[PDB]
Structures are given as C-alpha cells and as structure tokens.
C-alpha cells in the first residue's frame, strides 16, 4: 500500500504558507522526473505558485498527487490597444492583464488621483477619448485569497492634425 497525503496544512494552500506532505526503508520524492528529497516528508519554507505540480514517492511507486497553490492576483499590467498613443475622438481599450488562482472575480479601475471608475470587467473601452483623459491609470484584481495592484500605466491622447 503506497500513497501520499497532505499532512501539515489543513488545506488552503496559499503562497505565504509553509507547505508539506509525507509518504507512507528508503524514501524518494519526484517531480518532473527529478528527485527532490530522500526523507519521509518533502517540505517547503515558503511555497511559490511554480512549486505546484504532480508529485510522487516510492520506497512500490506512489500514484500521482497534484499540488495546487492558490494565490492573490500578481503580475498585473494595463495593456492598451491600439496603444498608449490614441487620437482624440477614437477608441482606447485598457486590458488588465492578470495571473491568479482562482482567477480574478471582479476588477477595479483607478485614475491618477486614485478615483474609482465605473467599470468592473477585465477590459475597459474609453470612447470617445478626449485629450483631458490623458494621464495615469491602473487596475486591481481580487479573488479568494487577496488583492493585486498594477503599476501606473499612462495613456496619451493627441489631437488630430486638423
């Protein structure tokens, strides 16, 4: 009888936690074809989302158990289409690129003065854009764990050559 459990955290595998699990003599662990430990338990001091994957042990081989890490939205950046240089009177679309697990439930958009703007989706269409709308904008993601902020990405509105 060979298998693996997640002793040490109740559940709720979040990136700040010190995670663990033990195999139930000569111990061996394995992830992605490489052995990561010869002890009975394979433990982490601070879990990172890339530590997530399918692990296995053998003392005869265990069956694959998938480690899943939940984390607040990270690496948020405001993309702009067609770009950050849009002519006045046309469209400027702001996309809040995100990476989270579970994915972002709702977004929140702000301007340079940290005033919330009435939009909740991942993409925000400004139309028609005005030269007064030139300035810094940033979004915010939210999920089960926490929040995530994006840096100030500015959009420039230029007049038309007439």
């Amino acid at each position: 009888d060979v298998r693996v459990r997640k002793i040490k955290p109740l559940s709720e595998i979040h990136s700040g936690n010190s995670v663990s699990l033990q195999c139930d003599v000569q111990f061996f662990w394995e992830k992605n074809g490489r052995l990561l430990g010869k002890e009975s338990q394979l433990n982490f001091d601070s879990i990172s989302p890339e530590d997530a994957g399918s692990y296995s042990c053998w003392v005869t081989a265990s069956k694959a158990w998938t480690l899943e890490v939940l984390y607040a939205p990270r690496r948020l950046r405001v993309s702009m289409s067609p770009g950050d240089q849009v002519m006045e009177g046309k469209s400027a679309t702001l996309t809040c690129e995100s990476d989270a697990n579970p994915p972002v439930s709702h977004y929140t958009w702000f301007d340079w003065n940290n005033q919330s703007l009435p939009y909740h989706s991942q993409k925000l269409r400004l139309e028609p854009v005005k030269v007064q709308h030139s300035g810094a904008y940033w979004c915010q993601g939210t999920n089960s764990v926490g929040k995530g902020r994006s840096p100030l990405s500015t959009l420039t509105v230029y007049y038309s050559p007439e």
């Epitope: 709702h106 301007d111 005033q115 703007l117 009435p118 939009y119 139309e127 005005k130 709308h133």
Partner: antibody, heavy 124, light 110 residues
Framework: QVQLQQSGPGLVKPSQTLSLTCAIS??????????WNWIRQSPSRGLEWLGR?????????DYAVSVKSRITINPDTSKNQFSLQLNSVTPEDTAVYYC??????????????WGQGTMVTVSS | TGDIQMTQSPSSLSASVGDRVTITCRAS??????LNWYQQRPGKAPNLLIY???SLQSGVPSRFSGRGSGTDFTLTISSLQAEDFATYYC?????????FGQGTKLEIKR
Amino acid sequence: QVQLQQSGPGLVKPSQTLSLTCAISGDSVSSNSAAWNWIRQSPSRGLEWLGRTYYRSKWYNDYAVSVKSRITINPDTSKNQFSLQLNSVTPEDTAVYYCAREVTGDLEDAFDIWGQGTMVTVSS
Amino acid sequence: TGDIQMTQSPSSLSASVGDRVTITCRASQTIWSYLNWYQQRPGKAPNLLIYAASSLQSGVPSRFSGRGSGTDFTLTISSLQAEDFATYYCQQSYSIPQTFGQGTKLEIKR
C-alpha cells in the same frame, strides 16, 4: 430624497435632432459615486441602454454603438442637469426615453433612481 | 465574445394571488453577481427590486428574493400579491454596454 425630472419636446420632425433634459434633485451630476444614464424603451425593442456621462477627475462618456454616431450626453454643472441629443432622428427612434441615476459602487451597480419618462414621436 | 445578451424565461406566466412564482435570467457570458432585477408597473418607470443578484433594495417587500451568480439567476415571489402585476426585467452591470432581458409579463388569475 433623490429625484429626476425630465423635460423636452415630445414631437421631433424626421432628420432633425432630439433634445431632452434630466434635472437632478438631492444629488449632483458631478458625483464620483454615480453615473447618469439614458435608457429608451419601445414595444418594438424593449429596454435599451443609450449612454451615460459621469465625472471622476474628468468628464467621461460611454455610448451604445447603435447611436454612437448621433448621440451626445453633456452634463450641466450650473443647473445640475444632463442632456440627451440624438441627431438625424427616424420614425424608428420613436420610444419612451428615461433618465436614471446609476449608483456605481465597487459591488453594487444598478439604476436606482429613474425619471418619469418622455415619449418622443418622430413624425411629419 | 461581444455584448452580453440576457434572456429571461418564461416570457409570460399566469398565476393567482398567493402563488409561488420564479423568473429565470441567463447571461451569454459570466457576469458574476453584477445582476439587477427591476419591476415596471403599468404606466410607470422601472423600479429597482434587487441589486447584486441577492440584495433587496430599500422599501421592496420581503416576498421578493434573488439568487444566483455567474450566468444563471432567479427572481422569486414567494406569495404573489395583486400589486405585483407588472413586467419584470433582469439587467447586467458587469460589462459595457449594459443589457436588459426581454422581460416577463406577469398576469393575475382570479
């Protein structure tokens, strides 16, 4: 108590431009926690959102693509109103036009205060 | 994917006073809990009944209730009253343009 009062001509000749006004009581059009919309209703098509104007640090506008070419929603800070202008009207534009306050919270986003409505007929 | 389209069911229903009635609203794309329910009595503007899928607006009787998130929602009148004769609409506020359902006409048998 927040109330919205509508006014404007209910008979517009074809190819001419509709113009309505929604007066605000108990609130300001420059409210950073709200947005001021226009919604039309007809038995032909039902309720259709037309556009809105709101102020945060600048004045912004969101428009339905149906009327993007003809719609214009400008606020009035001195009289605490916001307008609706629709150029080159057709008999298809005959409908009841509502103004409404949109409470724009982070999680609550609804039209809670509505105007009484203004029936507009496009006819010669 | 485009504009979010709301479809209500049924388009019309008949019920007697005191009956339990439910109105379903489905969104073509997920809107989480950015859904609103309105009541339009004859000759009147739409009235906000429920916002954020499940929260009752001030003044609305307790017989109205909302439920759901994502793409499928439900408006419930536990004990129908004669005053509830109206058309009911669902509306999403998650994405611009905001869109309404086609409405549900509620007629009272007596």
